[PDB]
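#struct-pred

JT: dropping the chains for the assembly here, can someone run the whole complex?
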Amino acid sequence: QVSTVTKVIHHELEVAASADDIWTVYSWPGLAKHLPDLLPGAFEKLEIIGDGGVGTILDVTFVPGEFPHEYKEKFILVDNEHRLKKVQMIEGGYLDLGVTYYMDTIHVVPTGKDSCVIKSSTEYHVKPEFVKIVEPLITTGPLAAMADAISKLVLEHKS
Ligand SMILES: Oc1ccc(CCNCc2ccccc2)cc1O
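RK: done, full complex below.
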């Protein structure tokens, strides 16, 4: 049995809003329900199972054509002290393409009174034979699109 491969991807978005202002949205139990009210064209559908807080499960279906089709995500952790959120893919998606573990992390870091950076990362463990296949497919795209969307929600509410 040959060693599992670990891969990390990282995206950052500078924002002219305080780390609180941006954490309040990422940590908002009602963020999940707002998601099409933020990223149209992405989702065919989005079932939510729970309160919207830690332990909530998202069933996500994308518009016919593009990969993956479906998958389920679970809110694993919110830490208001560190402004750190973790979201794990628990079923479908890449997990049917030899990925044994896929975890999104969002860290909102202060850079002075009225500004912060959104540090989004993804860590995955993949069976070494599938690395050629999945490495081109797992991109920041999803977390970049969330960082952009949240950023432009907040800058319009603060302005
Ligand atoms: O912090 C979160 C991270 C992820 C989600 C669920 C959907 N995945 C992210 C996405 C965005 C855009 C196109 C596809 C997938 C909810 C969160 O609150």
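JT: nice. Residues 1-159 form one domain. Strands lie at 5-15, 43-49, 57-62, 70-79, 84-92, 99-110, 116-126.
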